Amino acid sequence: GYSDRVQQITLGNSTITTQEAANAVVCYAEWPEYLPDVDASDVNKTSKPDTSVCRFYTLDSKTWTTGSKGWCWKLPDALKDMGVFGQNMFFHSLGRSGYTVHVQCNATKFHSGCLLVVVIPEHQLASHEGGNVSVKYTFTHPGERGIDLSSANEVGGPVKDVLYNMNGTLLGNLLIFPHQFINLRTNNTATIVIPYINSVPIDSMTRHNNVSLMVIPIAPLTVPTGATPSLPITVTIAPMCTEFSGIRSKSIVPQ
């Protein structure tokens, strides 16, 4: 009796189990793969740390309240300080990778709520100042903490109206991107496998974030009478088929 609901994912020395999933998504039906000779340019032999960087890293938990707007992480940024994966990121000029994103959030058969979990390739954010104002480096590299869409604007930062996906497009159409929902009455986890998506074979992992992951409450949280009005949301990410190239000094980045 094998079910869509029960799953195990093992990468490196880390394993994940879930007994209430809803299948899993593989962005554009493509599993992550290494860089083949025919597509390469950079003549340097690449490094493949394998299990030392292709494992599950669990970010800090977020707190879902009746008022939460959503959150937004960015990869590889979000893992910039995670074990050997992070280290390699700064020591190399170039690098490419895919990931397996696992978002968790359990409640009860009495609760109600629906989170939209989506991956957006090249999620170029907009500045709340409008006109032609930029969005400073630090603000799109929140790191492990991520960006909290319900926090207030800050000078140099991006706009954070969930309604406009932080980029001038409507929330409702975010579904055209590989996504999955965490509907408390059905779900408790969302899983999305992301293959390397870019217009270049390999790229800089510090100055360019390939995709951003967003967890957005659509149907607000609802707890049973007299219960704590909050649920934690955890995000665990694991790189896969990671490749680094052009090793050297180690970047020193803004802030």
Binding site: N23, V25, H179, N187
Partner: protein
């Protein structure tokens, strides 16, 4: 090709119309899965909705202006518009922009069409036959400073000379540095705390200068130049949410403060027809 097969009564354990959208998949449910249908054919291929057709027509991408007048005493030819330039980009005029921005990456060859029209706003005894010179000035090439620089020799830069009122046509191969053009870019030119963000640092395609070869006549003539772009041999990747809010700047995804609601509001109930 069938559009709908013949399907009659049903009473199964196989419930096709019951799915779980939280999986992230859009199950291919057909009318014949929820109602009794008759056979019907397509008689349609979908040729007009092929990306090669969607971006396959000319769209205006830039309007600029230059003028033919006495240059004697002018200190900044550029400011006077004795010659003017266009910092090439496809996101200045929104119509084409929204289309292109329906995808994340896009690759294709381009066919340009430059239309120049003349205007004599104040007293002239005739309309002169002016010839325009449009010269592509790639990044690194010396920019023109005066309307009759040495730069207009264009020994290596490519350029066209055509009559005003007439049109200029030529095509350009995919000149992207990468394998495709980025419509979006969540990155910077380098790890610096103040540098620009967005495709602004990626689509650095140089600019093309325009001037009017003829010397000046007694009267002043105003030439307005329009550049049209048509993509051909199209390839697009990663579709995305269409743009909803109006644009504010070339390259940025920024949208104006205090902008009007884009989703229409019902003149009534959620039960209203």
């Amino acid at each position: 090709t069938v559009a709908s097969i013949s399907s009659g009564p049903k009473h199964t354990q196989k419930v096709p119309i019951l799915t779980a959208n939280e999986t992230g998949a859009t199950m291919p449910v057909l009318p014949s899965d929820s109602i009794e249908t008759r056979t019907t054919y397509m008689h349609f291929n979908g040729s007009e909705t092929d990306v090669e057709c969607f971006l396959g027509r000319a769209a205006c991408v830039h309007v600029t202006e230059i003028q033919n007048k006495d240059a004697t005493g002018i200190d900044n030819h550029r400011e006077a518009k004795l010659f003017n330039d266009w910092k090439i980009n496809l996101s200045s005029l929104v119509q084409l922009r929204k289309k292109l921005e329906l995808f994340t990456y896009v690759r294709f060859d381009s066919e340009y069409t430059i239309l120049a029209t003349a205007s004599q706003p104040d007293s002239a005894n005739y309309s002169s036959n002016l010839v325009v010179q449009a010269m592509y000035v790639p990044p690194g090439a010396p920019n023109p400073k005066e309307w009759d620089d040495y730069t207009w020799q264009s020994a290596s830069n490519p350029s066209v000379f055509f009559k005003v009122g007439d049109t200029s046509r030529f095509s350009v191969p995919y000149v992207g540095l990468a394998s495709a053009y980025n419509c979006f870019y969540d990155g910077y030119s380098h790890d610096d705390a103040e540098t620009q963000y967005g495709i602004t640092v990626l689509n650095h395609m140089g600019s093309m200068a325009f001037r009017i070869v003829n010397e000046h006549d007694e009267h002043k003539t105003l030439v307005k130049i329009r550049v049209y772009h048509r993509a051909k041999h199209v390839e697009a990747w990663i579709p995305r949410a269409p743009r909803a809010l109006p644009y504010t700047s070339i390259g940025r995804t920024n949208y104006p403060k205090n902008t009007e609601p884009v989703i229409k509001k019902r003149k009534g109930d959620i039960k209203s027809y």
